[PDB]
Structures are given as C-alpha cells and as structure tokens.
Motif scaffolding. Structure first.
Motif, PDB file in Angstrom:
ATOM      1  N   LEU A  50      17.328   2.708  47.590  1.00 25.36           N
ATOM      2  CA  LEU A  50      18.623   3.377  47.539  1.00 25.36           C
ATOM      3  C   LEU A  50      19.706   2.318  47.724  1.00 25.36           C
ATOM      4  CD1 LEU A  50      19.522   6.613  49.646  1.00 25.36           C
ATOM      5  CD2 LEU A  50      21.213   4.894  48.956  1.00 25.36           C
ATOM      6  N   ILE A  51      20.588   2.190  46.737  1.00 26.26           N
ATOM      7  CA  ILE A  51      21.647   1.187  46.785  1.00 26.26           C
ATOM      8  C   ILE A  51      23.055   1.788  46.801  1.00 26.26           C
ATOM      9  CG2 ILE A  51      21.296   0.803  44.291  1.00 26.26           C
ATOM     10  CD1 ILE A  51      22.557  -2.011  44.718  1.00 26.26           C
ATOM     11  N   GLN A  52      23.913   1.236  47.654  1.00 27.22           N
ATOM     12  CA  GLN A  52      25.318   1.627  47.692  1.00 27.22           C
ATOM     13  C   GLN A  52      26.219   0.399  47.680  1.00 27.22           C
ATOM     14  OE1 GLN A  52      27.130   3.415  51.328  1.00 27.22           O
ATOM     15  NE2 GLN A  52      28.018   4.944  49.955  1.00 27.22           N
ATOM     16  N   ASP A  53      27.037   0.283  46.638  1.00 30.85           N
ATOM     17  CA  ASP A  53      27.959  -0.840  46.502  1.00 30.85           C
ATOM     18  C   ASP A  53      29.036  -0.539  45.462  1.00 30.85           C
ATOM     19  OD1 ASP A  53      29.009  -3.285  47.120  1.00 30.85           O
ATOM     20  OD2 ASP A  53      27.259  -4.466  46.525  1.00 30.85           O
ATOM     21  N   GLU A  54      29.958  -1.481  45.271  1.00 31.15           N
ATOM     22  CA  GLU A  54      30.917  -1.431  44.165  1.00 31.15           C
ATOM     23  C   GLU A  54      30.169  -1.174  42.849  1.00 31.15           C
ATOM     24  OE1 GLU A  54      32.744  -5.268  44.252  1.00 31.15           O
ATOM     25  OE2 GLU A  54      33.591  -5.035  46.261  1.00 31.15           O
ATOM     26  N   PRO A  55      30.798  -0.458  41.898  1.00 27.54           N
ATOM     27  CA  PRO A  55      30.052   0.014  40.724  1.00 27.54           C
ATOM     28  C   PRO A  55      29.344  -1.068  39.888  1.00 27.54           C
ATOM     29  CG  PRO A  55      32.426   0.443  40.523  1.00 27.54           C
ATOM     30  CD  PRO A  55      32.151   0.122  41.949  1.00 27.54           C
ATOM     31  N   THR A 115      18.829   0.747  51.314  1.00 22.45           N
ATOM     32  CA  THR A 115      17.818   1.326  52.175  1.00 22.45           C
ATOM     33  C   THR A 115      16.578   1.570  51.314  1.00 22.45           C
ATOM     34  OG1 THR A 115      17.286   3.169  53.700  1.00 22.45           O
ATOM     35  CG2 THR A 115      18.822   3.643  51.952  1.00 22.45           C
ATOM     36  N   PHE A 116      15.423   1.129  51.805  1.00 24.82           N
ATOM     37  CA  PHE A 116      14.194   1.175  51.013  1.00 24.82           C
ATOM     38  C   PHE A 116      12.962   1.470  51.852  1.00 24.82           C
ATOM     39  CE2 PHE A 116      12.331  -3.020  52.062  1.00 24.82           C
ATOM     40  CZ  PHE A 116      13.433  -3.651  52.659  1.00 24.82           C
ATOM     41  N   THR A 142      26.403   5.071  44.125  1.00 26.61           N
ATOM     42  CA  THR A 142      25.084   5.226  44.735  1.00 26.61           C
ATOM     43  C   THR A 142      24.016   5.399  43.661  1.00 26.61           C
ATOM     44  OG1 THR A 142      26.006   6.204  46.756  1.00 26.61           O
ATOM     45  CG2 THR A 142      23.688   6.612  46.328  1.00 26.61           C
ATOM     46  N   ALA A 143      22.843   4.812  43.886  1.00 32.75           N
ATOM     47  CA  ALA A 143      21.729   4.928  42.949  1.00 32.75           C
ATOM     48  C   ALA A 143      20.379   4.915  43.658  1.00 32.75           C
ATOM     49  CB  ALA A 143      21.786   3.825  41.901  1.00 32.75           C
ATOM     50  N   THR A 144      19.532   5.866  43.290  1.00 30.45           N
ATOM     51  CA  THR A 144      18.164   5.906  43.763  1.00 30.45           C
ATOM     52  C   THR A 144      17.298   5.277  42.693  1.00 30.45           C
ATOM     53  OG1 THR A 144      18.521   7.940  45.021  1.00 30.45           O
ATOM     54  CG2 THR A 144      16.240   7.397  44.421  1.00 30.45           C
ATOM     55  N   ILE A 145      16.513   4.287  43.083  1.00 33.41           N
ATOM     56  CA  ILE A 145      15.593   3.668  42.148  1.00 33.41           C
ATOM     57  C   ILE A 145      14.162   3.930  42.602  1.00 33.41           C
ATOM     58  CG2 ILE A 145      14.955   1.549  40.939  1.00 33.41           C
ATOM     59  CD1 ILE A 145      18.009   0.706  41.723  1.00 33.41           C
ATOM     60  N   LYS A 146      13.398   4.571  41.726  1.00 33.06           N
ATOM     61  CA  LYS A 146      12.017   4.915  42.004  1.00 33.06           C
ATOM     62  C   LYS A 146      11.130   3.881  41.336  1.00 33.06           C
ATOM     63  CE  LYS A 146      12.795   9.905  42.164  1.00 33.06           C
ATOM     64  NZ  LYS A 146      12.249  11.212  41.678  1.00 33.06           N
ATOM     65  N   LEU A 147      10.399   3.110  42.132  1.00 40.57           N
ATOM     66  CA  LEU A 147       9.558   2.058  41.568  1.00 40.57           C
ATOM     67  C   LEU A 147       8.226   2.597  41.070  1.00 40.57           C
ATOM     68  CD1 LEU A 147      10.366  -0.628  44.200  1.00 40.57           C
ATOM     69  CD2 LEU A 147      11.292  -0.538  41.882  1.00 40.57           C
ATOM     70  N   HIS A 148       7.666   1.934  40.062  1.00 34.95           N
ATOM     71  CA  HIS A 148       6.426   2.386  39.427  1.00 34.95           C
ATOM     72  C   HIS A 148       5.300   1.357  39.518  1.00 34.95           C
ATOM     73  CE1 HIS A 148       8.094   6.058  37.473  1.00 34.95           C
ATOM     74  NE2 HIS A 148       9.217   5.366  37.516  1.00 34.95           N
ATOM     75  N   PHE A 149       5.656   0.083  39.673  1.00 40.56           N
ATOM     76  CA  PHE A 149       4.653  -0.984  39.657  1.00 40.56           C
ATOM     77  C   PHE A 149       4.776  -1.965  40.820  1.00 40.56           C
ATOM     78  CE2 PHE A 149       5.248   0.439  35.243  1.00 40.56           C
ATOM     79  CZ  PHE A 149       3.950   0.820  34.920  1.00 40.56           C
ATOM     80  N   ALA A 150       6.008  -2.282  41.202  1.00 36.55           N
ATOM     81  CA  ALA A 150       6.263  -3.208  42.301  1.00 36.55           C
ATOM     82  C   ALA A 150       6.385  -2.479  43.641  1.00 36.55           C
ATOM     83  CB  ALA A 150       7.525  -4.026  42.017  1.00 36.55           C
ATOM     84  N   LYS A 151       6.198  -3.221  44.734  1.00 32.06           N
ATOM     85  CA  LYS A 151       6.545  -2.750  46.074  1.00 32.06           C
ATOM     86  C   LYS A 151       8.022  -3.029  46.351  1.00 32.06           C
ATOM     87  CE  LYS A 151       2.864  -4.599  48.126  1.00 32.06           C
ATOM     88  NZ  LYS A 151       2.279  -5.411  49.233  1.00 32.06           N
ATOM     89  N   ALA A 152       8.710  -2.036  46.917  1.00 32.46           N
ATOM     90  CA  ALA A 152      10.126  -2.148  47.283  1.00 32.46           C
ATOM     91  C   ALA A 152      10.436  -3.409  48.102  1.00 32.46           C
ATOM     92  CB  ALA A 152      10.586  -0.891  48.020  1.00 32.46           C
ATOM     93  N   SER A 153       9.594  -3.700  49.091  1.00 30.35           N
ATOM     94  CA  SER A 153       9.772  -4.872  49.952  1.00 30.35           C
ATOM     95  C   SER A 153       9.636  -6.192  49.190  1.00 30.35           C
ATOM     96  CB  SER A 153       8.796  -4.833  51.125  1.00 30.35           C
ATOM     97  OG  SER A 153       7.464  -4.754  50.656  1.00 30.35           O
TER      98      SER A 153
END
Lengths: 135, 138
Positions: free
Chosen positions: B118-123, B109-110, B77-88
């Motif tokens: 938020l991403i969940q997958d194989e490592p 989920t975004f 699992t990883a949370t990615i916090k964007l700074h410049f782009a829109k998640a969509s």
C-alpha cells in the motif's frame, strides 16, 4: 492427598530484559497489555531485531517444590555428585508417599541443593537416603 | 531519513497455556497482578512431565506482528497485489541504492502474508513506483 512437583514461572521485567538484549543499536525500540514498536533504516536488520525479541525467553524459573495438595524440622543438603532431579525421581519412585502430609522438598538442578521440611524422623531418614544416593 | 517500522503485540496467553497444561496432565495457576506481572504455577505428579510442560511454555512465541510500515520519521493511494515476488524483497530492491524512494510525505505499508503493498505519496511518485513494482513482480 496426592504429591505433586511444582514450579513457578515469573515473566521477566520487560524493560530491563529488552535493554540487556543485544539488539542492533540502529533499532529504535518504543514501548506502549504491552506493544513494542521497532524502527530501523534497514529491513534485514529490522527482521533480525524482531527475531531476537521472539527468540527471547522471558520466563524466570524459581526452584522446584515437592509437596502434598506438629513440630517440623528442616535440613539442607548440597549434592556433590548426583543431580537433584535424579535423586528426587529415585526418592519418589512408586505409589507410597515419601513425606508425611505436612512434608515438603524444595530442590534445584542448578545449585544441586535440596531443602527438606518434615517431621523429625522423616527428615532424619530421608537425609540419610539422599546421602547414599550422592554418587 | 526513512525508516521501516513494525509493531509487536503480546499474544493472548490464557487459552493456549491451559490447553498445553492439560495435554501433559499439568495443573496451571495463572496469577495475574494488575499493578505487577503474570506468574504461572505448574503442577505435575511426574517430574519429567513437569519439565516438558515448562519447555513447551518456553517454546511459545509470545509476539504477533502487524504489517511493516515504511515512512519518513494532494496525496494519491494505491494497493498493489503481488503475484510472484515477496513484498519485503521488492521493498529491499526499491529502497536499495542511495537516495530516498518516496517524498518526505510518502509512506508504504506492506505485508508478506497477504503479499500486498500500500503506497501513499504525491501522484507522480505513486505512478512510477507502481510501475517499478509491477516490473519487479515476476
């Protein structure tokens, strides 16, 4: 002891309304208060489906009742020129009462139909008044 | 076949309705039937003021939206916090072009508000998409 204009807003049946809404057929809609779950392969389409539901006006209007919070007569007038609401503003202008405490008018700008219920003389004179305003 | 998913919840009606009724001097009767529907009776001494109350109620957005969920209809699992782009926009870029972005066990989920992903997958999947997202985030 003070006359009011009244309107009832009834929220439309959700399932039939949503079914009639022209959503992209690729949008899967699931219904669960109520929740809607929307699915689509295409994010832009999903947003457009969301926007369509949000823009959706769910409120059905039911004609306008004008009343006060023994024999009564009823007359129905179809206007051929003037708008019902304009006629009603004209009839009800000023501090005095148009109808007796027991009187009421149901009117509609869509059908331009006015239905008055009050004591015989009140009904007679208001009907005449409405008639001279129909132009 | 991977899909985007969004839940629309019906917003709380009561307080906002009474507030926008009071503002036009409009009396409001909420009729709430258990095994039926909700009805509003609006009252105003002025007709034009009644119409405005009606219009305002019609203009109310009835729906609140939660984050978008992207999934197939050991995991990392990883949370990615964007700074410049829109998640969509990142998601359109990532999912654009043929082929699946994630493995069948993967989900994202975004939300454009908090602008989180938020991403969940194989490592290995998490690793490379996290890398791809960080390149797109400028």
């Amino acid at each position: 002891q003070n006359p009011v204009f009244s309107i009832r807003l009834k929220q439309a049946p959700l399932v039939p309304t949503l079914q009639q809404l022209a959503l992209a057929h690729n949008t899967n809609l699931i219904i669960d208060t109520v929740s809607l779950q929307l699915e689509n392969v295409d994010l832009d389409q999903l947003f457009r489906s969301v926007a369509k539901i949000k823009q959706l006006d769910l409120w059905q209007e039911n004609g306008i009742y004008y009343f006060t919070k023994a024999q009564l007569n009823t007359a129905t007038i179809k206007l051929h020129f003037a708008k019902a609401s304009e006629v009603m503003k004209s009839l009800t202008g000023g501090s005095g009462s148009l109808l007796s405490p027991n009187g009421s008018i149901t009117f509609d700008d869509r059908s331009n139909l006015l239905l008055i219920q009050d004591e015989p003389r009140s009904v007679r004179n208001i009907k005449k008044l409405i008639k001279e305003l129909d132009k």
